[PDB]
């Protein structure tokens, strides 16, 4: 019709959404958990320091076994580590050094890497030739791969510098669904545990919840003042944390459609680089541009602890599926394991 | 204690370590460079000229005088560079191409902003990102011959009133363009290096070699406590 119609209906619907949210704001999380006993100090020690990356570690992913993790560095290697034994299981020479994302398939059979090359490189770990080789070069994006995450051995969700996400069929090497609706450079993915949903943060400071199967953006979360560098689902799939360059995390609930809590402190001017939840959801661990990770009580927003063993920007932070340990990777090339 | 299999795993780990160290040696003996430029700055013809002069992201390996140069053209990234330009925090230089013909061109596609003022805005933003405090900037002012044409047809005073020099002279105009770019650096310890080149000129790879040599001399001055 005309912008004097459609772009005013958009405003009316945005106002109706905000009104519906504020009607849903029965009581903030901080009021309901005011009676919850705090978690105290979560003191944690560096149990492992995985040394052998030579450039900035950019991304990591725990395997489902909660023991192996891949990690990507701009030396052009993926390293798979036995975190129990400090052993390097594989080091993969990558065609493009400019890695920025890393995924482990939940079976362990594959790893993915992506970068300024607009490819998510699916590497097969279990060949009979006993070398890792590139099984697929998923080459249909047109801006850098910011995040790749496997749904299954045949399916990976991907996030790019081009504002789109794409679901891929690895077998046929092609997009099965493209998720169009962010306006900013989209930065991080997390699949929900049921794998039926995922949530994505972009430089437009919005988070969008996508149906993998339908393709629809069910909901859009907007409370951040700047880019969502980092995103993670709360382990029930009903909430997710969003870390931003505004030096805040925010907890969004998928069914409140609303910001539940903000994790902020005046001393914290540095942006959040990674977020992950402890298995019970009770701790939210945030990496920073400051050379630290802060452990937040996700229910009460008290800083239960700080992981301070790094001498450069923490780039990635994953908690094992079993909750047993926190890995922290940083621009000092060291991947420190904590519990 | 470790079993026979855990020992052979450790041995694989240590063989991977020695491969990682040998690729560290290789990746450190190569000077990375980041080639940037505006649209129609001539990245293709410029690289092709280095390629004939030599004996979504394209790494061009060059190997000069036993030193290897990894000239990173980041290509057509449809992406917000603030989110990935820190990948190049470690590069020894930004190579910035500006075409000296761009002063007469206004952005025909969008508005009428000078093609040189967009190049100025990109130069300012790159030179002011905190990642590039240790990198120098190498500024190739390409297509001087097209400026040597345009000056006969489109006077530079009409597009930049700050030009005090003569309207006849190519030298005074390209000196003015270099001044108008060098003025943009607030980090006056950061040496901008600049060359005037043409697609005819094979010397550009020697200029790159020697500008990167000077950057490494400056860094070795800082690293070795020589002020």
């Amino acid at each position: 019709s005309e912008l004097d119609q459609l772009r005013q209906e958009a405003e009316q619907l945005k106002n109706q959404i905000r009104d519906a949210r504020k009607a849903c704001a029965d009581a903030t999380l901080s009021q309901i958990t005011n009676n919850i006993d705090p978690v105290g100090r979560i003191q944690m020690r560096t149990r492992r320091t995985l040394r052998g990356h030579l450039a900035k570690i950019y991304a990591m992913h725990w395997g489902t076994d909660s023991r192996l993790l891949v990690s990507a560095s701009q030396d052009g290697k993926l390293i798979i580590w036995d975190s129990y034994t400090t052993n390097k299981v594989h080091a993969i020479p990558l065609r493009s050094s400019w890695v920025m994302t890393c995924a482990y398939a939940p079976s362990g059979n594959y790893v993915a890497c992506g970068g300024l090359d607009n490819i998510c490189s699916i590497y097969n770990l279990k060949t009979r030739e006993g070398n890792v080789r590139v099984s697929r070069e998923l080459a249909g994006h047109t801006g850098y791969l910011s995040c790749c995450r496997f749904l299954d051995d045949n399916q990976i969700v991907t996030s790019s510098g081009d504002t789109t996400c794409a679901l891929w069929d690895i077998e046929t090497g092609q997009q099965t669904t493209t998720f169009t609706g962010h306006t900013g450079d989209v930065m991080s993915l997390s699949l929900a545990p049921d794998t039926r949903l995922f949530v994505s943060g972009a430089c437009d400071a919005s988070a969008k919840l996508w149906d993998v199967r339908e393709g629809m953006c069910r909901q859009t979360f907007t409370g951040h003042e700047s880019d969502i560098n980092a995103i993670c689902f709360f382990p029930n799939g009903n909430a997710f944390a969003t870390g931003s360059d505004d030096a805040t995390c925010r907890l969004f609930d998928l069914r409140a459609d609303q910001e539940l809590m903000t994790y902020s402190h005046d001393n914290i001017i540095c942006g959040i680089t990674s977020v992950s939840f402890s298995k019970s959801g009770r701790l939210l661990l945030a990496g920073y541009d400051d050379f630290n990770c802060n452990v937040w009580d996700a229910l009460k927003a008290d800083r239960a602890g700080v992981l301070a063993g790094h001498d450069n920007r923490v780039s990635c932070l994953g908690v094992t599926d079993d909750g047993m340990a926190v890995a922290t990777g940083s621009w000092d090339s060291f991947l420190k394991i904590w519990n | 204690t470790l079993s026979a299999e855990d020992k052979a795993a450790v041995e694989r780990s240590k063989m991977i370590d020695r491969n990682l160290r040998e690729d560290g040696e290789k990746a450190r003996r190569e000077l990375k460079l980041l080639l940037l430029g505006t649209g129609e700055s001539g990245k293709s013809t410029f690289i092709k000229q280095m390629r004939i002069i030599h004996g979504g992201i394209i790494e061009y390996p060059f190997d000069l005088q036993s030193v290897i140069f990894r000239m990173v053209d980041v290509g057509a990234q449809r992406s917000e560079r603030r989110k990935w330009i820190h990948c190049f925090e470690n590069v020894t230089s930004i190579m910035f191409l500006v075409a000296l013909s761009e002063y007469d061109q206004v952005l025909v596609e969008s508005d009428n902003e000078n093609r040189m003022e967009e190049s100025k805005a990109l130069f300012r933003t790159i030179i002011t990102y905190p990642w590039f405090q240790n990198s120098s900037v190498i500024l190739f002012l390409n297509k001087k011959d097209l400026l040597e044409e345009k000056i006969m047809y489109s006077h530079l005073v009409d597009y930049f009133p700050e030009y005090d020099g003569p309207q006849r002279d190519a030298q005074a105009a390209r000196e003015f363009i270099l001044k108008m770019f060098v003025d943009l650096n607030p980090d006056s310890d950061k040496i901008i290096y600049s060359h005037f080149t043409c697609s005819t000129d094979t010397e550009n790879i020697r200029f790159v070699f020697a500008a990167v040599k000077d950057t490494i001399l400056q860094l070795n001055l800082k690293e070795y406590n020589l002020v």
């Epitope: 036995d82 030739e129 | 079993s3 299999e5 052979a8 041995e11 694989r12």
Partner: single-chain antibody
Framework: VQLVESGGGLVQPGGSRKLSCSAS????????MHWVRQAPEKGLEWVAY????????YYADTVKGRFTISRDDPKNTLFLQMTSLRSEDTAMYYC??????????????WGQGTTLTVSASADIVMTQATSSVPVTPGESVSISCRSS???????????LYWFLQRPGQSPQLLIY???NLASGVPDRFSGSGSGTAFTLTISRLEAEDVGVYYC?????????FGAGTKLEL
């Protein structure tokens, strides 16, 4: 993936011969290599191991010093230079590849073997007290193995392996670390054990399952095999 062993045949005792095998279709330098031998009517015996990069070479006491194991990784070829050959060295010799990382399957591929004819101890003892089982297709049969030491290492891995030598071909890995089926093994195989007693349960047996079944330990060198239970159709 191929291993082709060659340079067997007949030698006079006290002689010397270099039998060899060449690898194709895999990153041989990544793999560690074992030699396993089989006397003309006897069980498997581990001869030697050479790891990736020619480190941590090991031999059996029956071949230590007298045999030397080497690899030409650029040529992807393995050589066993035998010397002081003896009547007890008459065997089929197998190249066996091996790879060692969390969750790997070592001993997965075995070359076709090479015959050597000669004209004529805290080593873990492995017992397969049942040397034969009469089997009928569709039956369930539960091969059992015992070791003179518990294979449950303190890291929780039971370093036990099962091999099937289908009659007239090289052994094939069925199970690694007591309870993982190898690539391509039918899911009808299953492994179980207490760490010192073990049982292989071939459910829904097939005529492809008859042959000789070896249990092996990978806790300590020398690597040791049971005598092998033969399944007879």
């Amino acid at each position: 993936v191929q291993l082709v062993e060659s340079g067997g045949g007949l030698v006079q005792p006290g002689g010397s011969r270099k039998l060899s095998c060449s690898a194709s279709g895999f990153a041989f330098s990544s793999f560690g290599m074992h030699w396993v031998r089989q006397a003309p009517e006897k069980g498997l015996e581990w001869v030697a191991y050479i790891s990736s990069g020619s480190g941590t070479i090991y031999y059996a006491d029956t071949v230590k010093g007298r045999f030397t194991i080497s690899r030409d990784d650029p040529k992807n070829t393995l050589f066993l230079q035998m010397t002081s050959l003896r009547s007890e060295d008459t065997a089929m010799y197998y190249c066996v590849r091996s790879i060692y990382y969390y969750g790997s399957s070592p001993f997965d591929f075995w070359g076709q073997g090479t015959t050597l004819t000669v004209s004529a101890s805290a080593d873990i003892v492995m017992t397969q007290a049942t040397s034969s089982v009469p089997v009928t297709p569709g039956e369930s049969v539960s091969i059992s193995c015992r070791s003179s030491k518990s294979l449950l290492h303190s890291n929780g891995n039971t370093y036990l392996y099962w091999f099937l030598q289908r009659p007239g071909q090289s052994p094939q890995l069925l199970i690694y670390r007591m309870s993982n089926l190898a690539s391509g093994v039918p899911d009808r195989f299953s492994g179980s054990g207490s760490g010192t007693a073990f049982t292989l349960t071939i459910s829904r047996l097939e005529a492809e399952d008859v042959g000789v079944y070896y249990c092996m330990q990978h806790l300590e060198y020398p690597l040791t095999f049971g005598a092998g239970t033969k399944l007879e159709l």
